Symmetry: C2
Subunit: 111 residues, 2 copies
């Protein structure tokens, strides 16, 4: 009756910013950043949720404009994602709850 979910082991290998607040992976799956949490005024934690949305033409980095989120995320061999801003993000979790698939990425201060 309460929230009963499970871990997902297949993470997208690439996320492209399609719009300001919509990303698409290699399977043409849309991920929506719903929440951005700021820890110690430095660390960012963004929650992305899978959703079937109606999309047309992708936007350019210019039309998208200034943001806290990268134009693209790329999965590295060590399991972390590299942002197009050259930063590295840790995958805190990737789960599925009653169909709802959520992924939580947290920014790291390395190289």
């Amino acid at each position: 009756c309460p929230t009963l979910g499970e871990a997902v082991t297949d993470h997208p290998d690439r996320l492209w910013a399609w719009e300001k607040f919509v990303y698409l992976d290699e399977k043409q799956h849309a991920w929506l950043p719903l929440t951005i949490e700021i820890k110690d005024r430095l660390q960012l934690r963004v929650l992305l949720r899978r959703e079937d949305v109606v999309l047309g033409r992708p936007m350019t980095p210019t039309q998208i404009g200034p943001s806290l989120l990268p134009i693209m995320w790329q999965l590295y061999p060590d399991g972390r994602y590299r942002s197009s801003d050259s930063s590295f993000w840790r995958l805190v979790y990737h789960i599925k709850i009653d169909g709802v698939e959520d992924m939580l990425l947290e920014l790291l201060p390395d190289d």
Copy 2:
């Protein structure tokens, strides 16, 4: 025993970005944006909380860099805040809970 708070009627008239994630008002009070919520991939809702932090020299708009948050918010005669990006934000609420003073601003699509 549970959360027992109360509304606050004195809202800051100006918020200046001091750092990427720290704002200061006219009373030299620091407000920390803790959460940014994205509604319908368009509307932004940012939660700011008052906190006594140690601050040195303010940063310039350049050092601050790209963001979803404005360099400054200004209280207008109608009770809404005007962002330095020329957008208007509605004050959803301003309360105090066991000392914790929170303010929630939500972006509006007008002029």
